[PDB]
Design an enzyme around this catalytic site. Structure first.
Site, PDB file in Angstrom:
ATOM      1  N   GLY A  78     -29.127 -13.065 -32.210  1.00 19.76           N
ATOM      2  CA  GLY A  78     -28.101 -13.144 -31.172  1.00 19.76           C
ATOM      3  C   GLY A  78     -27.599 -11.839 -30.573  1.00 19.76           C
ATOM      4  N   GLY A  81     -24.786 -12.461 -33.861  1.00 14.94           N
ATOM      5  CA  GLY A  81     -25.301 -12.863 -35.157  1.00 14.94           C
ATOM      6  C   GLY A  81     -26.747 -13.307 -35.135  1.00 14.94           C
ATOM      7  CB  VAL A  83     -30.489 -19.021 -36.311  1.00 23.35           C
ATOM      8  CG1 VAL A  83     -31.285 -20.107 -37.055  1.00 23.35           C
ATOM      9  CG2 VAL A  83     -29.227 -19.601 -35.743  1.00 23.35           C
ATOM     10  CG  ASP A 191     -26.350 -20.875 -24.450  1.00 31.34           C
ATOM     11  OD1 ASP A 191     -26.782 -20.673 -25.615  1.00 31.34           O
ATOM     12  OD2 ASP A 191     -26.994 -20.531 -23.431  1.00 31.34           O
ATOM     13  CE  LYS A 193     -30.837 -20.137 -25.161  1.00 33.96           C
ATOM     14  NZ  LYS A 193     -29.577 -19.542 -25.696  1.00 33.96           N
ATOM     15  CG  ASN A 196     -28.982 -23.673 -28.111  1.00 30.75           C
ATOM     16  OD1 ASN A 196     -29.292 -23.013 -29.108  1.00 30.75           O
ATOM     17  ND2 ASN A 196     -28.166 -23.218 -27.167  1.00 30.75           N
ATOM     18  CG  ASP A 209     -24.124 -22.918 -29.112  1.00 24.78           C
ATOM     19  OD1 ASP A 209     -24.958 -22.106 -28.642  1.00 24.78           O
ATOM     20  OD2 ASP A 209     -23.032 -23.198 -28.562  1.00 24.78           O
ATOM     21  CB  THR A 230     -29.142 -17.641 -21.682  1.00 23.31           C
ATOM     22  OG1 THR A 230     -29.882 -18.295 -20.630  1.00 23.31           O
ATOM     23  CG2 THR A 230     -28.835 -18.608 -22.879  1.00 23.31           C
TER      24      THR A 230
END
Ligand SMILES: O=C(NCc1cccc(O)c1)Nc1nc(-c2ccncc2)cs1
Lengths: 395, 396
Positions: A78, A81, A83, A191, A193, A196, A209, A230
């Protein structure tokens, strides 16, 4: 009645803000924020910190911590952060874990997205929304441990397949059911896209997310990042609210579908530019900037749904209802039904292998800095306060 | 055999635990109380946080045990950090004794830590020899400890109104001994037990109280501290040096108190008494010489022996090898009881009472009728509540 019952109904029950996890977050938060050489010059603080030393060391140990989990791949990364795909160490079980960085998130982008992010996945109670299983924290990160999505995101899909209007109708459809689900709770997903959009074992699509953007090395520039959402998938209104002009609602996600559908069909984003500025400018200019090639096939009706979404706010589709969206001729077929859908068989059903199977996911850097947090105070700033009660369990 | 999840769930359920449900409440209450001043709310983190939980702690403070639960009866003592008050629980109507400690005074005096062993001993002891703690709680201003009433008054009242037979002396000294061993076996020491801390119940038997000065043992059964005190009369020689920084001291310090209590029941005076702090202090160090017995008073050959044996140097002192070399003492031989039946036996004085509300066995008192002092409104964060967090305790 005689009230020791009045009391302890608050003591433990999840939506009470005195539920035990709040209380533990509390003592744990206070302690992180108390413990600092400058602040220990206060005999009160110092002595409090000494008595509670051992007992909070054990608390940190008994409550769920990051080391309870083994990290397999870091998939997506991110501004705020990352994932990672994780495996619990004793249960051997798989999850996708989001690390939100307390610093970058509290700081000056602010926009505090986490309560909302969290609360959605935990309480959505929807097939369409990925599930939050656990949440916990420490002095650096928040951690959302969410249900795992064995298929890819749709970014992977588009990478392998040229997508037929058939599939493209199907995914847009589940995304539409995903988007009302959230909107029904009063939430802006905010957000939206391909990244996600996740696929379960049935190849059915769920909404998330995550840690996000694209790519290394700044060519085929994949620029992305910035602050919120984004670049490609944002609305003119989201641009303008930064920005600082207006304020935007849930109308913004529908714009996003418009763009997403443009991508599966045309294989490219509507507003894509070299730079991000060339992209922000195109978007304000969407009336002139939005174009198709020719562009057979691209059925008339799909060009129409796209242009229904990709217009200015209050004239845009789905402002009156999601109902208006389903009536759209573009969803017309004998394959499935709106209320049946997820029962029906999905275009892509991922080829199993093991629980781990990583091929729907990438490998990343796994490196470096332990980047900044909350510079060391000479007095008490209570920086850990705003995250109190963020720890959450499965029941 | 216990999964971490459980240990933590059990950890919230244990009164002996500092992380349990009430403790973390105190903790949160604290932050509210100490964090909330308009100056500190200039910080968004703090401000945002107060507004969130603020009112909801007022939900807690009302349904918490609070001072208003209790109708005050008489003042049964004043210890200069506060006063002991005979109280009635307005609901259960059960009758208790309650000690009060000014949060302000202590903070003023440092001296903020001494009540932990005092509550620790009273709640967990489960002993016929110890005043029991039913509750502990706080509000901004004071602490509270709610104890079993001890209707017979203390030994200072008794000793005042009686000439004490060596058989009475045997009894009381004996219950003190068991009372001390109970506390020793938890791992504490009374550290100046005196007849004030000796209380009598409805039936005439004995229990120990006012445990504040208690010190928790460690390795070798010793301890030490700089700590400021009052009332040296009953205190051992080694304990007196322990301020000034001399040395450590054991539980043999408590056995000293017993030879003083014994000498004082028979003699009518303290053994080292003097008109000064110095004379008594020095009378004490000089115990080899200074200790004498009256002409007028003929005390049994093994009653002196017992006094003398407690009244010696620490390393030669009865109790050092165990509690049994004590119980086995010739002064303890007699036809009217044996150690095991002793709380099951009959008291030399059984108090005859008008009520459960009878104040007649204590001195009478009223109130300040005088000012109360506020912690000033703070510049930065201060934390004057921190040392009291975890002091809440209930009984079930
Ligand atoms: O709690 C005390 N200490 C006396 C005191 C007073 C005010 C402020 C202080 O700092 C100290 N002695 C104790 N007496 C009892 C008791 C229990 C039942 N009936 C009568 C007295 C417990 S502790």
């Amino acid at each position: 009645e005689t009230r020791f019952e009045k009391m302890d109904n608050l003591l433990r029950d999840p939506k009470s803000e005195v539920n035990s996890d709040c209380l533990l977050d509390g003592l744990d938060a206070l302690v992180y924020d108390l413990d600092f050489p400058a602040l220990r010059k206060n005999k009160n603080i110092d002595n409090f910190l000494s008595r509670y030393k051992d007992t909070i060391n054990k608390i940190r140990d008994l409550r769920m911590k990051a080391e309870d989990y083994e990290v397999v791949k870091v998939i997506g990364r991110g501004a705020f952060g990352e994932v990672q795909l994780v495996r619990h160490k004793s249960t051997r079980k798989v999850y996708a874990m989001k690390l939100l960085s307390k610093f970058e998130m509290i700081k000056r982008s602010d926009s505090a997205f986490f309560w909302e992010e969290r609360d959605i996945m935990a309480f959505a109670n929807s097939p369409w929304v990925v599930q939050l299983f656990y949440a916990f924290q420490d002095d650096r990160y928040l951690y959302m441990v969410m249900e795992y999505m064995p298929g890819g995101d749709l970014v992977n899909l588009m990478s392998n397949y040229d997508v037929p209007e058939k599939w493209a109708r199907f995914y847009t459809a589940e995304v539409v059911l995903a988007l009302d689900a959230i909107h029904s709770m009063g939430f802006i997903h905010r957000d939206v896209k391909p990244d996600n959009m996740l696929l379960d074992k049935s190849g059915h699509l769920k909404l998330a997310d995550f840690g996000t953007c694209m790519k290394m090395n700044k060519e085929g520039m994949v620029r992305c990042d910035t602050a919120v959402g984004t670049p490609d998938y944002i609305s003119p209104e989201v641009l303008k609210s930064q920005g600082g002009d207006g304020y935007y609602g849930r109308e913004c996600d529908w714009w996003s579908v418009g763009v997403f559908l443009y991508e599966m069909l045309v294989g490219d984003t509507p507003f894509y530019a070299d730079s991000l500025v060339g992209t922000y400018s195109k978007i304000m200019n969407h009336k002139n900037s939005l174009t198709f090639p020719d562009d057979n096939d691209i059925s008339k009706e799909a060009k129409n749904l796209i242009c229904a979404f990709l217009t200015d706010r209050e004239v845009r589709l789905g402002r009156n209802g999601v109902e208006e969206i389903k009536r759209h001729l573009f969803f017309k077929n004998d394959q499935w039904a709106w209320e049946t859908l997820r029962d029906t068989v999905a275009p892509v059903v991922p080829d199993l292998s093991s629980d781990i199977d990583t091929s729907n996911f990438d490998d990343l850097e796994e490196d470096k800095g332990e980047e900044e947090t909350f510079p060391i105070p000479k007095a008490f700033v209570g920086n850990q306060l705003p995250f109190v009660g963020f720890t959450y369990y499965s029941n």
